[PDB]
Amino acid sequence: LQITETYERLRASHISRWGIVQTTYPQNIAEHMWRVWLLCRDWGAAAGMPQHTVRQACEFALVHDLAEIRTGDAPTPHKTPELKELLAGIEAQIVPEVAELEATMAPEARELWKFCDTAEAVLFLKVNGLGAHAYDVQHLLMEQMKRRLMDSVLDVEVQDELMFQFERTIKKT
Amino acid sequence: LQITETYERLRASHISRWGIVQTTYPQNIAEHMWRVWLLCRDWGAAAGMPQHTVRQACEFALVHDLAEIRTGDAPTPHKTPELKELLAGIEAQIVPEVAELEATMAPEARELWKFCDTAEAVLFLKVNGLGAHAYDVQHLLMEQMKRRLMDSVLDVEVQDELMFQFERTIKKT
Amino acid sequence: LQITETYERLRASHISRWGIVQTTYPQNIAEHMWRVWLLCRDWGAAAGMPQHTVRQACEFALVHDLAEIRTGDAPTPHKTPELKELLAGIEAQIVPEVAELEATMAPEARELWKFCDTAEAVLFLKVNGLGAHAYDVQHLLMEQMKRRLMDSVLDVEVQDELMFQFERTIKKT
Amino acid sequence: LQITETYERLRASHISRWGIVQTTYPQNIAEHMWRVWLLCRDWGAAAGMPQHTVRQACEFALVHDLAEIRTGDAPTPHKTPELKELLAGIEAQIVPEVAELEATMAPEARELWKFCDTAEAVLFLKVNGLGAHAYDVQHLLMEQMKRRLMDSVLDVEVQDELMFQFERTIKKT
Amino acid sequence: LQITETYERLRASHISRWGIVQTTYPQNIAEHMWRVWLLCRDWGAAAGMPQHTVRQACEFALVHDLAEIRTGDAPTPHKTPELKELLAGIEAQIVPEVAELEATMAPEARELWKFCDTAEAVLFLKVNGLGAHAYDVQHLLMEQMKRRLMDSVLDVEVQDELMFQFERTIKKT
Amino acid sequence: LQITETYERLRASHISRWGIVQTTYPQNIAEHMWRVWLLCRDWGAAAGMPQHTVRQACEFALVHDLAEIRTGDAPTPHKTPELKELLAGIEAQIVPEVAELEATMAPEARELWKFCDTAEAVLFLKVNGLGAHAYDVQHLLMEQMKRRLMDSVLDVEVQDELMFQFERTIKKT
Numbered sequence A, B, C, D, E, F: 001l002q003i004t005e006t007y008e009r010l011r012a013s014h015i016s017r018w019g020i021v022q023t024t025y026p027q028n029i030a031e032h033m034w035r036v037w038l039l040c041r042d043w044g045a046a047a048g049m050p051q052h053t054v055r056q057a058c059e060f061a062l063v064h065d066l067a068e069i070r071t072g073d074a075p076t077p078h079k080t081p082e083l084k085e086l087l088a089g090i091e092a093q094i095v096p097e098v099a100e101l102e103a104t105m106a107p108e109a110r111e112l113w114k115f116c117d118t119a120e121a122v123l124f125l126k127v128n129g130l131g132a133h134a135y136d137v138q139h140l141l142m143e144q145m146k147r148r149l150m151d152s153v154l155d156v157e158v159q160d161e162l163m164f165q166f167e168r169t170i171k172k173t
Ligand SMILES: Nc1ncnc2c1ncn2[C@H]1C[C@H](O)[C@@H](COP(=O)(O)OP(=O)(O)OP(=O)(O)O)O1
Pocket: A017, A018, A019, A020, A021, A065, A073, A074, A075, A076, A077, A079, A084, A117, A121, A137, A140, A141
C-alpha cells in the first residue's frame, strides 16, 4: 500500500483529474501540483505573508495529492465527512510523509494552499471545461473558494489581495 | 445526491475510467457498459446459460456503473472491504434502481457479469494501455478474472466455454 | 463480410463518428449506442409509450450501427435514397440479425428510436462540436428531428412530451 | 452538393481517416494528401520517371480526396465495384475538377500515385495503429500495394526502385 | 544536419505547431502546409494574379516549413531580427532546396504566400484555439496580416480581393 | 518580453515539449518540471548528496523552463553553441530571476539537475514515444545522460547511485 519508490511517484503524471467532468484533455496531478505551487509562491508573496508560511504552503502543494497514485482522484462533492475520515486514514498509510506535513501545516499556510488549490481548478476549467455541467462546476468552485476564504483566519487585507490577484489572473486566462 | 434526470445519466460519457493508469485515451463508462453488455450477451449464449440468466446479466451490464456519474470511477485495488461497504450505501442512495437490480441478481448472472466486466478491462488495456504499470495491471486483472471464475458457482463446462471464448477474443484484439 | 465474432463486435469502440465534422474527440459507436439506448428507455417511459414499444426501440438502439464495424460511419447528407438502398442490402449481409430486428420494428418504436438517435447527436455536438460548420450541423439535425417527429405517426401528446424532455435535457447539457 | 468555396476546401483538415481502425489520433485528409504528394515527388524522381508523369501524380495527390469533405472517408474493403461506381458519379458532381484530373491521368502517373497512396497508409499505421486489427490492416495494405505494383504497366526497374525506397523508408519510420 | 531522406520529410506530420498556445489538438506542419497551399491556389486565382505568381507561391507553400523537421516550430514573437538571421543560415544548410526557392520568389508571390500563411493560422485558431491568450494571438495575427498586406507591393485591387475572400472564409469557419 | 505575471507563468501548462517527435499526447513543461523536481529530490537523497545541493537542484528544477512560455521549447540537437549563446541572453531578459538562480547553482547541483532533466525525458518517451525516430531519440538521450554524468565532477559513488536508481526506475516505467 505505501508508496516508497520513485517509479511510483513519477506516475503522478498518470493520474487523471476531473473524472466526472468533460474537459478538452485529461489533466494530471503533476501539472496540477506544479500550478498550485506556483500560485502559492506568487500569491503568498503578493499578499505579504511571512516567508515561512509561504514556504510551508509551497512544500505541501508539491506533494499534497501523491496518495492519488493509489486512490485515484475523486470528485469534491463525493467527499463527505465520513468518506474523508476513511480516506485520511488510508492516505496516511500510503504517504506517511505527506500526512506528517499536513499535520504540521499552520492554519495560514493551509488557507493559502486551499485557496490556490481551488483557484487552480477554476482557472483550468475556464480554459478546458466543456459543456453546461463543467461551467456550473467552475462557478460552484469559485463560490466555494470565496466562502472558505472569507470565513478563514487570514486577515481581511490578505483575503482582499488574494481575491484581487485571482480576479486579475482569471480575466487573462 | 440521487440521480433522477436524463441529462445526468447522459453524462455516463463524461465519466473517465483508468484514473491511475496511463492509456491512449480516456475511456468512458458508456462505451465500457456497452462492451460489457455485448460480452454478457455473446458469451452467455455461447456458454449455453439460461436465457433468463443472460438477460439479467445484460440488464445489469447496461446500468451497473451509473453511480459513478456522482462518485467517479475508483481503482480496484483501492476498493477494500471497508470502503466498498461505505460506497454501497452511498451508491444505493444515488441509484436506488441499480441497487435493487444488484440485490435481485442470481449468482450465475452475477458471475457472468463479473467475468465480462473484468474481461472487457483486460481487452481494453491490451489495445490502449501504455507502459509497464498498465501492462502489469492488464495481467493482474486477467489472473483475478480466472481465479474468481474458477472459484464461482458456474459449472466447469460453463467456466471452460467462457475461458475458450475469452482467449480466442483477446488473441484477435 | 458477415460479422460473426465477439472480437469484431467489440470493435464498435473502434468506429469513429463525425468523420466530416470537427469535434473535441472522436466519438465511437459504442458510446453513441449506449446513449441512444438510454434516451429510448427514459423518454419512451416519460412519454407513456407501451412497454413493448419502448423495449423494441431499446433493443434496436443497442445494435443498430453494428454494420459500421465494416462499412464505417458515413455522413447523413451523403446518404441519398440510391446510396441507402445499396447500403441496406450490404448491411443485411453484414448483420442479418440487425436487419431482421429493423424489419420487425413497429412504426412507433422506429419513431422513438429515430428521435433519440438524432437527439443524441445534437446533444453530443452541443458539448463537443467545434467551429461554424459543426454549429450549423447541430442546428440542422435539431430541425430535422423536429420535422420528422411532427410528421410521424406518434400521437401529438407523445410528440409534445418528447420535445419537452429534449429541450429540458439540452438546456442542462 | 458541389464544393465551390475555400471555406469548404479548408475542411480537408476536418475529415478523419481510419474510421474503422483504432489509431493514436484521428489523421485528417490534409496531412494525408501532403504526405502522398511528398512520396510522389520524391519516389517518382528516385525512380527516374518522366517529369511530366511525376508532376501529374503530384497534382492529383494534392486534391484526390477533396470529395470526402462531403462523402466522408470510407474503408477500402467496403468499396466494392458496385459502390465505387455509385461513388464515382457522386464524386464527379462534388468535385468536377478532380474528376477531370483523374480522367486525364496517364497510367504511369496513376500507378505512382496509387503506390504512394497505399504506402502512406502503411507508414501511418506503422507508427500510429493500435491493436491486432490495425496490425493486420497495415500488413494487408502492404501486400495489396505490392501486388498492384507488380501487375502494373510500370517497368520492372521502376517497380524495383519504388520497393527499394519503400522498404528503406518504413525501416526508419 | 541536412535533410536528404523521404523518411525524414515524412516527419512533417510529427512536427507540432502552436507550442506556446493552448489548442484542442496539436496541429502538424503537413496539414498546415496543405492548407496554405490551398489558400494560395484559390485566393491567388480569385485575385486575378498571374499564373506564374500563383504557381510560385503554391510551390513554396508546400515546402516552406521543412526545416522545422530539425529546428522545431518556434513562436512568431520570439523570432526577432537577430534570431531570424541565425535561423536563416541554419535553415539554408538543413534544406538548401527550400532556401533556393525562397531566394527566387517574386515579391508578389511572397506577399500572397505570407498573407495565406498568416490567414491559415487565424483560421485554425478560430476553430481550435482555447482560452484568452489564444484569442489574443488569433486577433493579433489578423491585425499583423492586414498591416503587412496594406504595406505590400500588391495592387490595392488585389489587396481588397484577398481581404474580401478572407473575411467571407472566416465567417464560415 | 519579461514575464512578470502569474497568469503568464500559469501558461507553463500551455507549453508543449517534443515538438519534433511523435508522442501519444503533448507533454507540457509544468508536468515535466514537477517530474524533474521529484527526481532531484529522490535521487539526490538516495545518492547522499548534501541537503543544500539537493535543495538548489530542486529549486531550479521547478522554474528552469519558464522562459519557454515566450521562446517555446526547441529540440536539443538544434541548440548549437551559437544558438544557445543567443538564447541565454534572451532568456535572461525573459526571466531574470531564473537566470540568477542558474548563475548561482553549484556544479554538483547543476549535474544532479541535468541528469534528472535528461532522465525524465528518457522515462517519458519510454511510455509515450511513438515510432522509430522517437525510439532513437530515447536511446540517444540515455547515452548522452550517461556520458555527461561520467565526465562530471560528481564522485564516482554518486554517479553509480544515480545510474542504479535510473535503471531500477526505467525497468518499472
Ligand atoms: N463540483 C464538482 N464536481 C465535479 N468534480 C469536481 C467538483 N469540484 C471539484 N471537482 C474535481 C476536481 C478534482 O478532479 C476532484 C477532487 O479535487 P481535489 O483537488 O483532489 O480535492 P478536494 O479539494 O475536493 O478535497 P481534499 O483536499 O479533501 O482531497 O474533484
